[PDB]
């Protein structure tokens, strides 16, 4: 509607936190763990681990598009500027009553069922010179991946190679042309952030990301396993779920982007590894063009 120049900040946003709590509450009401293990500490070093056992009914789990709107007294601003890095002023600004469809997909190292960037692949980082800051990548072309029961996932090799190539090109645009882009697997950590994890059909899938994230400038089948013992993304702790239901478990998702981390440093080479584990970034992917102001 109105047209003014307004400063947008994606890295600090209330919508990200509120959506985070909403999805946490959603997973709290929908998916019930058979056994929940949470840390409890008084600050005296020793920490007693509390265990909560409840019913764990198997339910059908699918993400649904969720539009977000501002109630009376508030309005949501939207940046229509092409290739917006996520921060700073914005020329064309449209005030929207409701945000577009956003699927609450919880996953690491890969963004599924999201939204593609229109004119090209766009990378966004709070601080690019900071190696601790996660880099959000948004593709201009979707890559379909078929994941089936008993863990495996087949996807197009050529499309993924070309994708990694273009992403590498954009990384050469950001970090300079003299640098050589080399992709490597995770440096290690909790099994959730080391491999590619996600929820399909109410079951937790962990697929090996090594084949995808190993690449250099000069029909991929990912082995997958269903883990019934996982680390809760909502809060620090572990949870044990029910055995995987019998029959075919299959989900075909579109990959709209990735989460990457950059190694620290010299000399002439930059290493990029799969990131994620923070779902706030996953919401920030679709929420980067939105902000909340009061009228």
């Amino acid at each position: 509607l109105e047209n003014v120049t307004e400063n947008f900040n994606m890295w600090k946003n209330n919508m990200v936190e509120q959506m985070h709590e909403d999805i946490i509450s959603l997973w709290d009401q929908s998916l019930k763990p058979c056994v929940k293990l949470t840390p409890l500490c008084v600050g005296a070093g020793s920490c007693n681990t509390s265990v909560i056992t409840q019913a764990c009914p198997k339910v059908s789990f699918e993400p649904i598009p969720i539009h977000y709107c501002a109630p009376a007294g508030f309005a949501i601003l939207k940046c229509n500027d092409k290739k917006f890095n996520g921060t700073g002023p914005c020329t064309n600004v449209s005030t929207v009553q409701c945000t577009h469809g956003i699927r609450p997909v919880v996953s690491t190292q890969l963004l599924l069922n999201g939204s593609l960037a229109e004119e090209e692949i766009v990378i966004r980082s709070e601080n690019f010179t900071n190696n601790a800051k996660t880099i959000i990548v948004q593709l201009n072309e979707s890559v379909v991946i078929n994941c089936t029961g008993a863990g495996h996932c087949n996807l197009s090799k050529t499309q993924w190679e070309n994708t990694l190539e273009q992403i590498a090109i954009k990384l050469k645009e950001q970090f300079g042309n003299n640098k050589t882009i080399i992709f490597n697997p995770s440096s290690g950590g909790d099994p959730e952030i080391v491999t590619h994890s996600f929820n399909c059909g109410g079951e937790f899938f962990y697929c090996n990301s090594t084949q995808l994230f190993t690449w250099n400038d000069t029909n991929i089948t990912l082995p997958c396993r269903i883990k019934q013992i996982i680390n809760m993304w909502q809060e620090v702790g572990k949870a044990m779920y029910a055995p995987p239901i019998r029959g075919q478990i299959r989900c075909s998702s579109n990959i709209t982007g990735l989460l990457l981390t950059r190694d620290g440093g010299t000399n002439g080479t930059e290493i990029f590894r799969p990131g994620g584990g923070d779902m706030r970034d996953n919401w920030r992917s679709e929420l980067y063009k939105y902000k909340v102001v009061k009228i």
């Epitope: 056994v35 265990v51 409840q54 019934q228 013992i229 044990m240 029910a242 055995p243």
Partner: antibody, heavy 128, light 110 residues
């Protein structure tokens, strides 16, 4: 192969407490879930409770709740059963049992409630 | 509070014949059922689990069947060591509360 060897027979006075042990060997200790089943003489089987080894979590029967505690020592690979406030009706043969849940360290748990393996049994007599 | 009741209490079958045991539940236990065999002075032995599957070490003559609140343990040919006290178990519900049948005594008929 599976090997389960329980503690010797115990004799306690009413009001006291009894603690029996069950030694497990031949396989990985954290990959199994351990259930205790007591059988009164002339009577049938009764489920006391079942403990998950990997998560160190134990569940008990509603009627035995709060007066019984099932624990697991992973270092010595031994499952302990503790019963307090013993009564004359608590006299029975206590069987230590367990079942293979798959690989618990890799996150695979079948959560099986049945019992594949059993122990030799431990006679516990509570009388004055 | 699932109650497992087995029928009959005592079944006398002549050697070389077929034996049929029944196990009923107060409510549907679904696909979760366990048949055990026990001999005097000995610990119970696992026979059937899930009621559709025969355990390792168990002769093929033992066959489980049924669903819901109804179950049947069928033995094609009774051998000398086949006579014992049989039990049924419900592991279905969560948080776990498990119950056993009152037992079915198999007797040699002469």
């Amino acid at each position: 192969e599976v090997q389960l060897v329980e503690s010797g027979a115990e004799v306690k006075k009413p009001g006291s407490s009894v603690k029996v042990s069950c030694k497990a060997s031949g396989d990985t200790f954290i990959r199994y879930s351990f259930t205790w089943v007591r059988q009164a003489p002339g009577q049938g089987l009764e489920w006391m409770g079942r403990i998950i080894t990997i998560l160190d979590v134990a569940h008990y029967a509603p009627h035995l709740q709060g007066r019984v505690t099932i624990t697991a020592d992973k270092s010595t690979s031994t499952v302990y059963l503790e019963l307090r406030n013993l009564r004359s009706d608590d006299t029975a043969v206590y069987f230590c049992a367990g079942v293979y849940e798959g690989e618990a360290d890799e996150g695979e748990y079948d959560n099986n409630g049945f019992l594949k393996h059993w122990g030799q049994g431990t006679l516990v007599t509570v009388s004055s | 509070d699932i109650v497992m009741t087995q029928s009959p209490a005592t079944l006398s079958v002549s050697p070389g014949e077929r034996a049929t045991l029944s196990c009923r539940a107060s409510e549907s236990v679904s696909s979760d059922l366990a048949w055990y065999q026990q001999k005097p002075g000995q610990a119970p032995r696992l026979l059937i689990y899930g009621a559709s599957t025969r355990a390792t070490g168990v002769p093929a003559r033992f066959s489980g069947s049924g669903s819901g609140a109804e179950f049947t343990l069928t033995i094609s040919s009774l051998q000398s060591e086949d006579f014992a006290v049989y039990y049924c178990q419900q592991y279905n519900n969560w948080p776990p509360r498990y119950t056993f049948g009152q037992g079915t005594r198999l007797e040699i008929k002469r």
